Design a protein around this ligand. Structure first.
Ligand code: COA
Ligand code: COA
Ligand code: COA
Ligand code: COA
Ligand code: COA
Ligand code: COA
Ligand code: COA
Ligand code: COA
Lengths: 189, 189, 189, 189, 189, 189, 189, 189
């Protein structure tokens, strides 16, 4: 009961950024695969993450942070994190997502991104959600495309993939391109 | 016995803004339906709510905060929150209200608003209580109309409803339009 | 040359909220006519205004503050102040204006409000600008109507006019109702 | 002699971010045309700019800030500002530029951007310099294209132009696409 | 389960710089053999190491710190430490390593250095990793040579070995000289 | 008379790190040629240099800082800076040097480096002075070789020269290889 | 196991300056015989020693502090303290030693001093270790002579022995005069 | 008249440690000859000397500091500094002295040391004054011998002279060996 779930999809759900899962968030973010995908170069310390959780918690006016839950089992189980950095001046946000090592390839990322887009479009009233992802990360490309993102173009020589200089793909999503039924509309109506 | 009830209606009651219910207030305020109704775009953190409860508690000179109780059962059970921001210079206040997910549609909001208006008119000696509510939120419109509010007009293009730009309805209430018997008069006489 | 003018109309102009005019802003705001029009009940001190100017200056992210200049003479002369409190979440702002004692009735308020609306619509990208003004203040009503505001309704018994309890008129403006040519478009094109 | 010039082109030059020009930087940045081009919605105060200059000055490890000088006259005259926010992890930077009201259309922006790219490529050893510019700002598009930037794509509905929701064009530059002779190579060889 | 292992080789593995092992890190670093190999002259205190662990933990932006685990047994057991001081301006890092007294001569240092080089090359995207080691320390020379380092030269009379003034050997490693399969590539692909 | 000269060579001399020349030190260090030679990527601010001069001045226990004077004229004139970072544990130091734009190619760097080596060897009692210099900087190579440095080797791919990844040459100097007469011996005997 | 032993001789050993033995260090240092031998005139308080232990612990860059253990029994037992104050500028140190009341005359002081000299010569790379000891303290003279110290001379009238003004003997030790096998060499080879 | 002289000899005199001569004290102490004689390895900064003068001034309970004056001219002229660090527990002090570059070889050091010894013996009631001086510094040896110091012995390999490891001579002085008439006795009798 301690795990609150706000949006419930068919396969995944979103909840608050609970403080009981700071260690799990650290362990998820420190995985080498996540570091390669994000492009971060150095591991962060658990103490620094614990200290930074408070500053993340106070600064929630222009920041969306959700815990992704797997709803296929009897009870929800946290599997990843989604975040949107909101620029209230232009109604746009920047989207990031990561899942656990054992929860990838089961589809959860697609519905997690779709639910995050639903929340950003129908609750935060954002006009555009965009992201930057390294080109070789084709799985993330497919997940974002099926979630509702569209390709903008390639920013040449602005990232590293296994030490090699590669471009990154810029993608964006708009409310009129949002696929599937919206859970938020079910909440309102 | 810890749950103090000040005003007792037929279906609902009002009590103090207890500190034992900060987590419940957070959970009520973080519901997607409440966020859509209020028009808030980003969820707030539990730690920030716990920290802000103190600043709410000290600043009570020009702020009314009540906990709504359901009195249909054997014991009172908290179901929502009401608040009035008082401007002592002109004897006016701004009214907000929200109930829990499982307590809506049973009428409790109407008597909660009526009791809050009774307290504001006959204890706080306010000359006018007003609110701003999004136009598509028709249930709140009906609740406020039956509670004693009257429609002023529509403020064009000043809010978002499921990402769509919509107007909001401005409403006000005056003591001479207060319906039904007053509990405060029973307290005094 | 020290008086910077950003927007230049036919009769009036807008400039920055200069620190060399804090005493003049105080003297303008302390006039009994301005106190009656705004509805403020107690005079403010010059020292408090000087201290508060800094806090006004730092907090400019969601606040527009202009100095109104009379351009009918050879050189610009400050005659009043305009301000818009911006709510970036919904792209709306609240508008206030006051002129000097000897500068009223010459029309400067109308073009000052029109230029402020032009700046808010075409630079700040606001979807709605609204204000609250006491009903007996008919001159301000006419100025706002000719500037581009439209009447919403009357909020009953929410203000004092010469000690008498009176209602206040709520007005709003939208970009599609903006009259006349836009100076900002001339700046861009 | 107080105006130091580091890079000297045929028409323009770059110098340090002098503290004697904080007021001029403020006046340049506060022009309505610059606000429209950047997409900033509210004017900043002179006191806030003076206070922020120090924090800009200390934080120079990952920030390039230049003053653009017009070298067509007998002595250099400052006309604008260029800045590159450097991300040392991936050797990329984000580029912004603005000129004075009376210095546009004379070509100075093109050589200013070219010299900034030369400095970033041959001194800062950046692999990619990118920018985001509103689509209707066609003059900036042409200036960046002739300076050495290439179009990536359009980010839909992520900015405002005169109150209208418009897309912004993403551009990038790479060392192998740098046009013209390099001044830095003349410095080294 | 508390011992997290990120990279797993055939004989050794790398994990985070856990706070539960500060005393063990102190005891490893205070061994006379480690002091002779590093060239440190005075022992450090346990209290100073405990205090300094926090400052090490916060400063992780340009610092890699791993705990070396022996994977030959049933469960991982910490045996040493590896560290890389990263200079993000030139994509280079300085490498140090030490093992426990009872864990030397079993080969663990070679694979520990190889895995650290793999992490630095394919996750941190470093172009060169270098170290300085005293010339008489021939075992470390052989370990670094088999791990992937190449000899640069000897810096004359810049260190002490058992009180005698000796030179130190400078070594470096580049991605194109990295031997063996890469674990990070297995993580990505 | 304010310019103190400690060591006097035939062409150049060394003096204290005077506080009257902080602006000149800034201007010398900010030259693009000096930035290319050192490998620094971003310019530093004058205010930051003025603030950092104090911290340089207090920390003089393990730091040598000299002002290079040209003694060919009637009076000494400052032309550059030399610095040695001393590691008292092993009696070694790291050497850097830069001259002004108009003072290069006249030989002053060679005698400045020779006098700095004389001071480090015969006053600081250092056993080895070493430096790291980019390979394409052949003029500095020749200056260091004639001053008394000897080549150690090349550290592959650890620096940038005009945006190109290049190696840097490591050099060292020992007292027994010090050329020419020593001024310090003339001081003592 | 809590008692760490670094250097192990035939009769005595050296370990870290443990914080669990602050009271024992106080009791050893407060003995009247130790006060007479050192020449200290007033007893120190236990609280002051406990407070000063921290400042001793942080300041370990130029300070060697060991706990002397008696290794003749089954388990090591602390019997005294040795300390060397290191002057890194000239590679020299000042040596002091004291043992417990019941541990003197068994030879432990000789091997404790010899092991401290071994550590200072072969780990700290000190060129000279010196001490000052009162002339009537003949037992300490013999211990230092057999440990490896040589007599320099007598400093006339610079100390008190039982209230009588006496001279003190100055002694020094050099690496080439170090007797017996070195444990540190066994550690290295 | 500002130059106070306490003890007046035939050729030299002693005065207070005036604050008007901090720059002159710095310049005297920074001379390469003084650095070689004392054995200091790095120059000190003028700002650090100015800051440290205050801490020298407050701490005068166990510190004698004099300014040496040349009395051969019409008016006293400062030529050097003498200092005695007093250990009040044993009535002993450590003596240092330095003169200006142009004031050596005229004998002033001998009478300066003699007057300092007179002050220490007959005013401070010290039983022994000692010093440590490098062996090759034969001029200081002769000056101390004629002043009243006697040789104790040589501390082997504890100092550097022009980079060469040399011994230092230890000397002491006692009241019964004080030569010549005492000025302090003339003051008292
Ligand atoms: C990308 C990531 C965040 C999650 O996205 P994702 O879950 O992998 O993307 P998907 O949801 O499409 O994975 C679903 C896979 O299951 C398959 N699948 C399809 N239908 C399915 C179903 N009904 N049930 C189960 N699996 C299904 C899909 O084909 C897909 O394989 P594919 O993506 O190669 O086409 C995760 O891979 C990750 O943690 N990456 C590391 C961090 C990172 O890269 N972040 C992004 C940086 S911007
Ligand atoms: C609006 C809100 C705060 C509570 O008001 P409310 O309880 O829904 O309004 P009501 O009391 O009229 O709901 C009573 C319903 O029960 C019905 N009802 C009538 N008589 C009843 C009775 N005797 N017993 C039970 N139910 C009855 C009413 O017809 C009404 O349906 P209707 O409102 O559609 O006409 C709640 O809906 C809510 O939490 N909204 C989200 C937050 C929010 O919107 N706040 C306002 C923003 S300004
Ligand atoms: C309202 C106020 C801010 C300025 O607005 P304003 O300048 O008075 O409104 P106007 O510009 O229409 O005054 C112009 C008058 O000149 C007349 N006029 C018309 N054309 C004109 C022209 N070409 N040239 C000169 N005068 C002209 C107009 O008829 C108008 O009279 P009217 O307003 O009664 O119809 C000023 O009156 C004031 O300082 N009030 C006190 C503070 C206050 O009330 N603030 C508002 C609280 S919300
Ligand atoms: C864009 C800006 C920063 C400077 O760039 P710019 O100087 O206008 O771009 P240019 O250098 O090409 O202007 C040169 C003009 O002179 C013309 N020109 C060509 N050759 C010329 C020559 N030899 N001499 C003089 N003029 C010449 C060019 O055709 C060009 O006209 P065009 O740009 O429409 O084709 C300036 O317009 C500005 O301040 N904008 C507001 C702030 C802003 O928009 N910043 C960018 C937000 S990302
Ligand atoms: C150097 C040090 C850090 C670890 O490196 P290392 O483990 O000793 O180097 P190695 O891995 O090659 O030791 C493996 C030995 O086992 C032998 N070996 C070879 N194959 C083996 C196998 N399959 N299984 C077991 N042992 C094997 C090797 O021949 C080697 O002996 P050698 O190094 O003399 O040739 C460790 O010695 C140490 O702690 N030193 C003190 C601190 C220090 O010196 N740090 C470096 C300062 S820069
Ligand atoms: C390198 C630097 C610091 C000064 O060193 P330098 O003065 O250039 O080296 P030199 O003293 O040899 O220059 C003397 C030149 O004059 C010539 N020369 C020879 N004899 C001469 C004489 N008697 N009189 C005048 N000139 C003479 C030499 O041939 C030499 O040319 P060369 O160096 O190409 O062979 C300066 O070039 C500089 O500021 N560089 C930028 C910063 C930098 O690179 N620092 C080093 C980074 S580690
Ligand atoms: C001096 C002191 C620190 C320890 O040094 P020490 O142990 O007394 O000196 P020793 O090791 O030689 O004592 C060993 C004695 O055992 C005898 N001995 C010789 N061989 C022995 C053996 N194999 N086994 C046992 N005893 C032996 C020695 O003859 C010696 O007697 P001696 O010193 O009079 O010749 C201790 O006496 C002490 O605590 N003094 C008070 C503090 C102090 O004075 N500090 C020094 C101020 S600088
Ligand atoms: C040592 C020092 C502090 C001053 O001492 P000093 O003045 O040189 O020693 P003196 O007074 O003997 O110099 C007098 C010289 O004049 C000669 N002299 C003798 N009688 C003389 C007279 N009547 N008139 C003039 N000169 C005379 C002496 O023979 C002597 O030469 P000598 O010392 O080689 O024999 C000074 O040399 C100095 O500044 N040294 C650098 C700092 C330093 O070394 N400090 C000591 C470190 S512990």
């Amino acid at each position: 009961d301690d795990l609150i779930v706000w949006l419930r999809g068919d396969r995944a759900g979103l909840g608050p950024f609970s403080a009981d899962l700071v260690d799990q968030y650290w362990r998820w973010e420190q995985d080498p695969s996540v570091l390669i995908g994000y492009g971060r170069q150095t591991p962060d310390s658990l103490e620094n993450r614990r200290e930074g959780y408070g500053h993340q918690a106070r600064g929630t006016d222009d920041q969306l942070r959700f815990t992704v839950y797997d709803l296929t089992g009897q009870d929800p189980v946290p599997v990843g994190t989604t975040a949107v950095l909101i620029d209230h001046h232009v109604r746009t946000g920047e989207f990031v997502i990561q899942l656990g090592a054992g929860h990838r390839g089961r589809g959860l990322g697609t519905e997690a991104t779709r639910l995050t887009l639903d929340y950003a479009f129908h609750v935060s009233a954002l006009a555009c959600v965009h992201l930057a992802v390294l080109t070789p990360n084709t799985g993330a490309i497919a997940a974002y495309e099926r979630a509702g993102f569209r390709r903008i173009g390639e920013r040449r020589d602005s990232g590293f993939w296994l030490g090699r200089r590669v471009s990154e793909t810029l993608m964006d999503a708009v409310p009129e391109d949002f696929p599937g039924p919206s859970v938020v509309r079910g909440f309102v109506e």
